[PDB]
Design an enzyme around this catalytic site. Structure first.
Site, PDB file in Angstrom:
ATOM      1  N   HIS A 104       0.885  -1.249   0.033  1.00 13.05           N
ATOM      2  CA  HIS A 104       0.027  -0.114  -0.150  1.00 13.05           C
ATOM      3  C   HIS A 104       0.910   1.223   0.043  1.00 13.05           C
ATOM      4  O   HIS A 104       2.190   1.377   0.203  1.00 13.05           O
ATOM      5  CB  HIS A 104      -0.879   0.023   1.297  1.00 13.05           C
ATOM      6  CG  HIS A 104      -1.244  -1.393   1.863  1.00 13.05           C
ATOM      7  ND1 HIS A 104      -0.405  -1.892   2.846  1.00 13.05           N
ATOM      8  CD2 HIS A 104      -2.245  -2.072   1.601  1.00 13.05           C
ATOM      9  CE1 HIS A 104      -1.132  -2.932   3.452  1.00 13.05           C
ATOM     10  NE2 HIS A 104      -1.886  -3.132   2.637  1.00 13.05           N
ATOM     11  N   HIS A 161       1.819   4.686   1.810  1.00 10.32           N
ATOM     12  CA  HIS A 161       1.386   5.314   3.226  1.00 10.32           C
ATOM     13  C   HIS A 161       1.383   6.757   3.015  1.00 10.32           C
ATOM     14  O   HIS A 161       1.933   7.251   1.776  1.00 10.32           O
ATOM     15  CB  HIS A 161       2.636   4.691   4.171  1.00 10.32           C
ATOM     16  CG  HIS A 161       2.360   3.371   4.533  1.00 10.32           C
ATOM     17  ND1 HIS A 161       2.173   2.947   5.863  1.00 10.32           N
ATOM     18  CD2 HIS A 161       1.998   2.153   3.706  1.00 10.32           C
ATOM     19  CE1 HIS A 161       2.101   1.664   6.026  1.00 10.32           C
ATOM     20  NE2 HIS A 161       2.002   1.136   4.639  1.00 10.32           N
ATOM     21  N   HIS A 190      -1.918   4.194   6.431  1.00 16.21           N
ATOM     22  CA  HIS A 190      -2.167   4.287   4.723  1.00 16.21           C
ATOM     23  C   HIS A 190      -2.605   5.589   4.272  1.00 16.21           C
ATOM     24  O   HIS A 190      -3.537   6.418   5.030  1.00 16.21           O
ATOM     25  CB  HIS A 190      -3.385   3.192   4.707  1.00 16.21           C
ATOM     26  CG  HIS A 190      -2.854   1.696   4.694  1.00 16.21           C
ATOM     27  ND1 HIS A 190      -3.699   0.558   4.863  1.00 16.21           N
ATOM     28  CD2 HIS A 190      -1.487   1.338   5.217  1.00 16.21           C
ATOM     29  CE1 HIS A 190      -3.099  -0.327   5.097  1.00 16.21           C
ATOM     30  NE2 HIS A 190      -1.682  -0.125   5.255  1.00 16.21           N
ATOM     31  N   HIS A 209     -10.000   0.036   5.864  1.00 17.22           N
ATOM     32  CA  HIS A 209      -9.228  -0.806   4.950  1.00 17.22           C
ATOM     33  C   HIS A 209     -10.021  -1.702   4.063  1.00 17.22           C
ATOM     34  O   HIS A 209     -10.786  -2.384   4.664  1.00 17.22           O
ATOM     35  CB  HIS A 209      -8.145  -1.437   5.793  1.00 17.22           C
ATOM     36  CG  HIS A 209      -7.056  -2.246   4.869  1.00 17.22           C
ATOM     37  ND1 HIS A 209      -5.906  -1.455   4.070  1.00 17.22           N
ATOM     38  CD2 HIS A 209      -7.083  -3.334   4.653  1.00 17.22           C
ATOM     39  CE1 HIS A 209      -5.556  -2.370   3.609  1.00 17.22           C
ATOM     40  NE2 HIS A 209      -6.045  -3.858   3.730  1.00 17.22           N
ATOM     41  N   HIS A 258      -8.981   2.148   1.265  1.00 17.44           N
ATOM     42  CA  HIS A 258      -8.165   3.489   1.595  1.00 17.44           C
ATOM     43  C   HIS A 258      -7.460   3.800   0.069  1.00 17.44           C
ATOM     44  O   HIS A 258      -7.241   2.728  -0.844  1.00 17.44           O
ATOM     45  CB  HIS A 258      -6.940   3.041   2.319  1.00 17.44           C
ATOM     46  CG  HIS A 258      -7.371   2.836   3.770  1.00 17.44           C
ATOM     47  ND1 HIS A 258      -6.457   1.997   4.597  1.00 17.44           N
ATOM     48  CD2 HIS A 258      -8.439   3.433   4.614  1.00 17.44           C
ATOM     49  CE1 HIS A 258      -7.021   2.148   5.871  1.00 17.44           C
ATOM     50  NE2 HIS A 258      -8.063   2.789   5.877  1.00 17.44           N
ATOM     51  N   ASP A 272      -4.722   1.336  -0.934  1.00 19.95           N
ATOM     52  CA  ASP A 272      -4.927   0.168  -0.820  1.00 19.95           C
ATOM     53  C   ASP A 272      -4.547  -0.537  -2.296  1.00 19.95           C
ATOM     54  O   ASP A 272      -5.490  -0.507  -3.008  1.00 19.95           O
ATOM     55  CB  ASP A 272      -6.238  -0.365  -0.265  1.00 19.95           C
ATOM     56  CG  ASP A 272      -5.998   0.058   1.329  1.00 19.95           C
ATOM     57  OD1 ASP A 272      -5.223   0.296   1.867  1.00 19.95           O
ATOM     58  OD2 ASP A 272      -7.486   0.036   1.629  1.00 19.95           O
ATOM     59  N   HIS A 297       4.570  -5.203   2.997  1.00 23.13           N
ATOM     60  CA  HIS A 297       4.468  -5.861   4.092  1.00 23.13           C
ATOM     61  C   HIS A 297       5.008  -7.343   4.349  1.00 23.13           C
ATOM     62  O   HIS A 297       5.199  -7.945   3.364  1.00 23.13           O
ATOM     63  CB  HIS A 297       3.311  -5.658   4.825  1.00 23.13           C
ATOM     64  CG  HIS A 297       2.786  -4.314   5.234  1.00 23.13           C
ATOM     65  ND1 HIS A 297       3.374  -3.565   6.226  1.00 23.13           N
ATOM     66  CD2 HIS A 297       1.999  -3.425   4.471  1.00 23.13           C
ATOM     67  CE1 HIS A 297       2.763  -2.547   6.228  1.00 23.13           C
ATOM     68  NE2 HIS A 297       1.962  -2.391   5.081  1.00 23.13           N
ATOM     69  N   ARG A 309       6.911  -3.922   8.142  1.00 20.14           N
ATOM     70  CA  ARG A 309       7.284  -3.352   7.018  1.00 20.14           C
ATOM     71  C   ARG A 309       8.589  -3.670   6.440  1.00 20.14           C
ATOM     72  O   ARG A 309       9.566  -3.321   6.983  1.00 20.14           O
ATOM     73  CB  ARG A 309       7.316  -1.768   7.062  1.00 20.14           C
ATOM     74  CG  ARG A 309       6.093  -1.242   7.725  1.00 20.14           C
ATOM     75  CD  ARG A 309       5.579   0.182   7.996  1.00 20.14           C
ATOM     76  NE  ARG A 309       4.469   0.619   8.383  1.00 20.14           N
ATOM     77  CZ  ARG A 309       3.960   1.691   8.681  1.00 20.14           C
ATOM     78  NH1 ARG A 309       4.790   2.725   8.412  1.00 20.14           N
ATOM     79  NH2 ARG A 309       2.817   1.943   9.095  1.00 20.14           N
TER      80      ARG A 309
HETATM   81 CU    CU Z   1       0.942  -0.483   4.130  1.00 20.98          CU
HETATM   82 ZN    ZN Z   2      -5.389   0.379   3.786  1.00 24.15          ZN
END
Ligand code: CU
Ligand code: ZN
Ligand code: CU
Ligand code: ZN
Lengths: 156, 156
Positions: free
Chosen positions: A48, A50, A65, A73, A82, A85, A122, A145
């Protein structure tokens, strides 16, 4: 006066790295995304954008996010998601991964622009908000992360 | 919205690295620039904003100095300069450097926004277009690009 290409080099301290490329034909049109990774553990990994393009403290300083529409989410395909996403990147047994997608919410222009923000991959799978766990509706319960990078403008 | 903070992590393969922090308290106000570096040779080093936030290929794709006003290379204080011209970073004997300046040409918003672009620190001194070299009025004849990074939006 509108961006049509962006690039993101993702690094970290987990042996995982990669490059992401974005292209956007029109100001508010869909964005084509293409990423490549190496050093990942076989399986799916949350992917995603950020809110902050800040990587001064690992990927932690990148924040949460990117969520300008203030939704929960979700999956890229969901209406409730998001803006940042992008679902899951799939790594094979060799630890390499190729990701392709066309997204209608992210953009390289306007309020939904990801330029200057960060991409983050992730350690675990993004449950797309359906996992039924505490963080499912917030992060997808994707955990740590592995790598990240700021999104920069690319040449025409 | 309006961005009040920005950051840039700079790395490379020359043993040089650094972190730049930008502050702009009002959308059209001056920009406070703070930078820290390590691994530099004693003396001055060209420090500029380049057009593309593309750091792939060891800073060779970052492009020329961010020059939206289509002028020639000069010193930060000159009336004639590239928006991206921030002068020189001064490394002490130990190779570390601290840079502080307030600039009115660069911005974190609008057409002169440096968000999503690259910061680049050079091998040699930026002669501020006063060196009498053809490259003086284009790059300041600052030499190779030791380290670079994409400018990202920071928490504010
Ligand atoms: Cu993320
Ligand atoms: Zn998200
Ligand atoms: Cu430069
Ligand atoms: Zn210049």
């Amino acid at each position: 006066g509108s961006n049509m290409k962006a690039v993101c080099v993702m690094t970290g301290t987990a042996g995982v790295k990669g490059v992401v490329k974005f292209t956007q034909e029109t100001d508010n049109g869909p964005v084509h995304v293409h990423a490549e990774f190496s050093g990942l553990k076989a399986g799916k990994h949350g992917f995603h954008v950020h809110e902050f393009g800040d990587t001064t403290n690992g990927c932690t300083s990148a924040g949460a996010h990117f969520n300008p529409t203030k939704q929960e989410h979700g999956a890229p395909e969901d209406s409730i998601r998001h803006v940042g996403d992008l679902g899951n990147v799939v790594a094979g047994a060799d630890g390499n991964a190729v990701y392709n997608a066309t997204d209608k919410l992210i953009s390289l222009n306007g309020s939904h622009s990801i330029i200057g923000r960060s991409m983050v991959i992730h350690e675990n799978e993004d449950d797309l908000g359906r996992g039924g766990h505490e963080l499912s509706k917030v992060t997808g319960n994707a955990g740590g992360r592995l790598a990240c990078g700021v999104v920069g403008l690319a040449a025409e």
